Design a protein around this ligand. Structure first.
Ligand SMILES: Cc1ncc(COP(=O)(O)O)c(CN[C@@H](CS)C(=O)O)c1O
Ligand SMILES: Cc1ncc(COP(=O)(O)O)c(CN[C@@H](CS)C(=O)O)c1O
Lengths: 358, 358
């Protein structure tokens, strides 16, 4: 059979080169990097190269930290609860601003902080489907410890004005965190232009393995650890290093930035080919804005057939996509134009054989 | 070259069968298990088998939870901070008892809770090098939310009276957590006989990969999540599942319990062969008790040559061990008797060529 994977915002395929670079640390180089003997120090060069790739991947400075976590969910929980202890309980700055579009890893923890008594405002989305930076200004008070706005939305793909928000946050002296998981390998990511204090990411969204993530912490910014133990990662996150996934995520970051032109020029062009081909069908319509979007995502809406039935039909035809009432289709570098023509055909055939209402 | 690995309490080698069972989920079965399409549901049988192996591995009941974490450090932070929020701030039961022998992942977080105002007593070790259960009784008051005592010590190998402590905790109605990482695959582990409410473990101590762990939570016991997001693991720990490491850790648990007789009868006998051979040397001495110890560990002390110099010498001879002022040697199933004879020889040769003081 020949299956079609169009659900790359849910997770991606590991690049074969990433798997290859991970194998030796799953095989004979099994030493704990904290060990003083040769099995330990033997792993250090590859770790340094992976970390270097990550730094260079997000234009982090050598003075900055890029701490290895187990996923973006860990990074988000760590920023929000850490800044809860440092600035809300200890500095009395009991206010956090975020958006309604953030991943549940951010919003649900924010709900928990509300249950403890922190006041959090979830900014409402506007009609163009994005946020404006002035919205955060209107919501930022002199008691705001942190603003957290995702770089790109996972359901629709829209890119948010992180740069301008970073300038506002910089002028007013409030910590800035951005969940950028959906941005890596899709668009250029620069922590300096964003003036970000915190940045989240997760490997399996740019063709690394599930179960490893990263939190960029800018130099000097404090954040009480979520994993206490104080041994690893400059004492900020304890636990024996996931050596294979660290190297793999480094190579995956490298490949992701090396493929940016291909992502925008080829993957984005196929997304436009696909989208335009699908909009040649009755009362369908893209949900959201079509200009300020990441190159890989289209979010299509159909008449009165709910999206989940169409997704059942496609999976029956071995074509994988996700929801977002609407259908989210998210591409990658490993899709081909033949795959897109076939998906246009199967989508139409499924659509007319679903239209038969009653 | 032929290197000798005797540092298995720091981390272990991945069993080749574990790597094999992980490869397909690093290759073509890359779907997010939360996805509704075939790439997602396609991973479910292997996940169920791995989880089943874990449950059966620690005699957990089907009514219980065995939540997948990213390491034992995550499990320990989660128990202590979770029980801090549920019973100390909300139920006013502001007291925790633990030991001075616990891993830094437990003790350092306990220090953090003290900084927030929780009163924690770290029980002192006695001369036989172990704790008695009555010590915890004397320290347990009507304001104790939780007692946390490790199953086996990582530096010395001594097995603690978890069973009896579980009975005391059960009679008095205080939550019981045990960090059992060093016990899995070394001695039988039974959460029911221990009457444990929480149990920690980490895969890479029984020949699985670094970067995945487990927290057993007994049925009905509450614990506010450390990873909020509420999607995965019955909403208790959010983040896209580390599919390959879950399957591998399941197979690793299976092999670990299947090798218990071999661990005590063969690995323990080689540890006794080695130990007795090394005690035939001047003013040396095993640090700690020699009866109630895990089968794989010996902790040897030498005259006035510090242990780190001896460890430098051994690593120069491609023999790996760790500290514990003393030298910790920790075996596994993949060591051979030839390896042990050679280590006895190299240890002696290093010892006499280190004795030359000034
Ligand atoms: C009992 C016990 N509990 C927790 C840990 C930490 O495991 P992690 O998977 O790295 O989080 C360890 C790991 N002890 C190693 C590495 S610090 C040692 O050198 O002794 C342990 O022995
Ligand atoms: C922006 C953003 N931030 C965090 C996460 C969570 O990543 P983790 O590595 O699983 O913790 C995701 C993952 N969103 C997937 C799985 S819930 C989706 O279906 O949209 C994300 O898109």
């Amino acid at each position: 059979v020949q299956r079609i994977y169009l659900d790359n915002n849910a997770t991606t395929r590991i690049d074969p080169k990433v798997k290859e670079i991970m194998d030796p640390f799953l095989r004979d180089h099994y030493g704990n990097p904290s060990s003083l003997h040769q099995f330990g120090t033997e792993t250090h060069p590859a770790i340094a190269e992976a970390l270097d790739k990550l730094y260079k991947g997000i234009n982090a400075r050598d003075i900055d930290d890029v701490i290895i976590t187990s996923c973006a969910t860990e990074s988000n929980n760590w920023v929000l609860k850490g800044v809860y202890f440092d600035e809300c309980l200890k500095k009395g700055k009991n206010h956090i601003v975020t958006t309604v579009a953030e991943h549940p890893a951010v919003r649900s923890t924010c709900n928990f902080l509300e249950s403890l008594g922190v006041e959090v405002t979830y900014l409402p989305i506007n009609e163009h489907g994005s946020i404006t930076a002035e919205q955060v200004r209107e919501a930022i008070t002199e008691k705001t410890a942190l603003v957290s706005v995702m770089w790109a939305n996972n359901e629709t793909g829209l890119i948010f004005p992180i740069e301008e928000i970073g300038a506002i946050c910089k002028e007013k002296g409030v910590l800035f965190h951005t969940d950028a998981v959906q941005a890596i390998g899709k668009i250029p990511v620069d922590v300096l232009k964003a003036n970000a204090d915190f940045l989240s990411f997760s490997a399996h969204k740019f063709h690394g393995p599930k179960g490893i993530g990263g939190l960029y912490i800018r130099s000097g910014v404090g954040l009480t650890p979520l994993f206490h133990g104080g041994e690893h990662m400059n004492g900020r996150r304890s636990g024996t290093l996931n050596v294979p996934y660290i190297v793999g995520m480094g190579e995956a970051m490298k490949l992701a930035v090396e493929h940016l032109d291909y992502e925008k020029e080829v993957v984005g062009k196929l997304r436009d080919k696909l989208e335009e081909a699908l909009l040649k069908i009755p009362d369908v319509m893209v949900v959201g804005d079509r200009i300020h979007r990441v190159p890989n995502t289209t979010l299509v809406s159909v008449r009165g057939i709910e999206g989940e039935a169409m997704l059942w039909d496609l999976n029956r035809s071995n074509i994988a996509a996700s929801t977002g009432t609407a259908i989210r289709l998210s591409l990658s570098r490993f899709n081909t134009e033949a795959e897109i023509d076939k998906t246009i055909e199967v989508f139409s055939q499924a659509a007319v054989r679903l239209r038969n209402i009653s």
